[PDB]
Amino acid sequence: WELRSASFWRAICAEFFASLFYVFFGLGASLRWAGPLHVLQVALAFGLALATLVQAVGHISGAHVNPAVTFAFLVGSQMSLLRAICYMVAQLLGAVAGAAVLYSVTPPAVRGNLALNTLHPGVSVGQATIVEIFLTLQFVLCIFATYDERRNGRLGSVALAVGFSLTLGHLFGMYYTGAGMNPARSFAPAILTRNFTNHWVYWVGPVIGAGLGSLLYDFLLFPRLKSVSERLSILKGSRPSESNGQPEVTGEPVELKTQAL
């Protein structure tokens, strides 16, 4: 995108529709009460909603459908600061819309608080934030590892892997925090029910967890060594042509710094 990338705006639309669908189906399947089979069912719904959407638009935008996941990819230097923000914008509006459309087609009484992420009475906000961190951490770690082109021919469906990771996060987390693992998914129910009690947990946990996962993977487990050069050349895009010059100032690592950053 400094020339004819409709395959940037298609991805933005992907993230928008996938987030609407993700939230619409995730929240919709969470309406009511109950954890025994309630948890299993909601865990599977979110997991399968993600696996479905990652198959649907994973090849088009990477299927982030999650600000925390996009953030993970930003600090991981795999997308530009521009795409990230557009992705999150699309995801936030996408979620709100799905939550909206969900509200419009769902009978009251069943609506409840639209599956608003909520902490368990006996769980402090600090504990809940650590939980949300671990949930998103294993989640992002699974995303990075499975999206990683440098590995496996025995991966199977990465869409399912990621989805089942989300399911795992719910199977464990719902009892604690209803499992947010996704700012956008927590936001949607929040802004429509005018209730931001403890909402900070659902942005901070996933974001930190997402950051730790990106870190844990890229800077330790399976390093994806990138020089500050490429890193910066990533959160800004524009690569690698357009410049002027027949031989062009580009060559010979002679300590002359780098012939411009």
Added chain:
Amino acid sequence: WELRSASFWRAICAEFFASLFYVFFGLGASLRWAGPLHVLQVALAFGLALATLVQAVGHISGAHVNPAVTFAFLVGSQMSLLRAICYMVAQLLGAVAGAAVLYSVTPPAVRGNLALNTLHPGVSVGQATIVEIFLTLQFVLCIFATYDERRNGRLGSVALAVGFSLTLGHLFGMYYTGAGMNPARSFAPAILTRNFTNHWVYWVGPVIGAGLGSLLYDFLLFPRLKSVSERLSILKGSRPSESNGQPEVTGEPVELKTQAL
């Protein structure tokens, strides 16, 4: 099929048997009452019935086993108007038979209304139609994306993806409309119980949803640009030989229109 395509009639048989099996097992596993674990179980049964059948005959006919899905592929210009109708005919008779055979081997009292798709009292037919649309939309979107030859080597089983998409549709939709997502599957229980109350919902929602999914994908997310030429040459078949002429009137894009449509 203007010469020796038994691999058109084999596919028709595939769609017929798969629809019988699909409906037979889906309806059969839905007999009774209950949603908590009822939903999880029925959602999985349909999902696994589809994943099973898509593995079984997906390579033979594409495993549509769903008029709405076939319709999706028609407006998507991936099959002829002839195949589509034959597919739907096979699917409708296939479903009815499965529902029939199901009735014949199932004890009354347990038969109920043969898992007839039904709306929830607090859900208007308009809301129910929007639900059925979203259900089929994410469903078809998953089918198009996963069937798309232009993508992934990390897809895993597309049969499972599609099946789990169907499961997702049920995990969410059953509470609202019992989740139709398939005219044929709704039809079968309908024509055998002589009850078409709200049946319009189960044809309109999936069909519109299927149409929106085909559109959303082909004309936006991952465009499959086809000229009106090929499009029309698709819903009619007959390609590309038989014509007469040594050099044959075929060549030079000189604005002469197209040397016949």
Added chain:
Amino acid sequence: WELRSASFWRAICAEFFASLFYVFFGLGASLRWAGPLHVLQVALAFGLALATLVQAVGHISGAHVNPAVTFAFLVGSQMSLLRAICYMVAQLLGAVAGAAVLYSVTPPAVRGNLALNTLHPGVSVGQATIVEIFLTLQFVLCIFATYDERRNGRLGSVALAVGFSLTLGHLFGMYYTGAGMNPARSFAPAILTRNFTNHWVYWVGPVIGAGLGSLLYDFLLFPRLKSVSERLSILKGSRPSESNGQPEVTGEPVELKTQAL
């Protein structure tokens, strides 16, 4: 096997251990009462036991672990009459052992009738046999289609496909017949509890269903055309060397019959 096939006896051992494990875990997870979540759990246990075993020994023996499945492969002309019988022998003793070892480590009271396949009071033995036929039919059809080397690169795990097919059979069938789909699995509980009431259903249904699936696939859906020559040369083995002769009586389709069957 008319020279140094330890890779025939390894497969026999595979079928023996897999059947012991299959029955041991399937029956073990079925002990108790309950269908709501009972069915879901037992359906998954068998399905995952199979998917596990098909991954474990599928490359070694094809992981039949089921007389009906082996029978399916026999009439399908994919194995010799010798292997089939040895397979079934291994599977029958394998099952009995697993059921045995299961009994030995399971507390009474919980033992019940060792998950003996049983018909539902309101289900006639004729209806139950048709159910068992459809269960095994979709099952075998999934096995043939997924084992078929002539297809898909988007199959994902065929072990899971097959396993989930088994799960589907249970999700539907357990309420009717407890879902046998496997003579050996029905036999084991039978011979150890000295109860063969309706046992005929559990041999006849799967066998006929297995036969119909093999047929439905090979002689209709995706034909695997084999001349009576190869067919017979299959249920007898011994191919294709050993004969004597420099030019050897083998050649020229001149209607001379076939230079010996």
Added chain:
Amino acid sequence: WELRSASFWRAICAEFFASLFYVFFGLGASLRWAGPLHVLQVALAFGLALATLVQAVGHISGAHVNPAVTFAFLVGSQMSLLRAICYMVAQLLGAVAGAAVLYSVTPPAVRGNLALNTLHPGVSVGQATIVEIFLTLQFVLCIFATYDERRNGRLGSVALAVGFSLTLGHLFGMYYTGAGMNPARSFAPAILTRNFTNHWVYWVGPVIGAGLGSLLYDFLLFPRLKSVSERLSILKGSRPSESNGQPEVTGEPVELKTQAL
């Protein structure tokens, strides 16, 4: 590792974090009571936790996250005595930490005994040990078969296969022993609750089962013939350079023993 293997210490970190996550999520999802849906949920949680972690770090360390599994690979001669011990050390501390972090963020009353593996009153410790053996045996067998580079292109995700094998172990075993299948996972709850009643079962069963699986596979089902030479050269590492000599004492199988072990 007698030169610059950070890709030995990265794997150790992998095993450490994966074990923390594995135990953290497995134990966390097991807190409470109930088996009907309790079992299904806990079986899935562990299974999906493993499938997730095997995707996450399977390409980095083989994702053992289980002393018994590592032991299996040791006697299977696929890792050095050095790696094995470091792996188990990382797994044991990893588990304890996860159990620790779990305790710190979980409300009391819900903490119980931190999902300590426990035998069923009517199950003798001898029976329980045989159960744990079969659980780990089918588990390890699935791991060996699916990790085996010498097979399948239809494997799908080996991470899911392995995970579902673990789920199967739980679906069956939880009623008997709560299903340990992993010393580290049993240890963590044990050392933090100061309760080692019957703990011997949870080391002995998996270890023996793991040993039998490694054996059953490597020395029978699909032999991986290795000469005592390579075997020993494996549990010690250091291969194959560093030696001195232009032609070097290496060659001609003339019965001279082997030119040094």
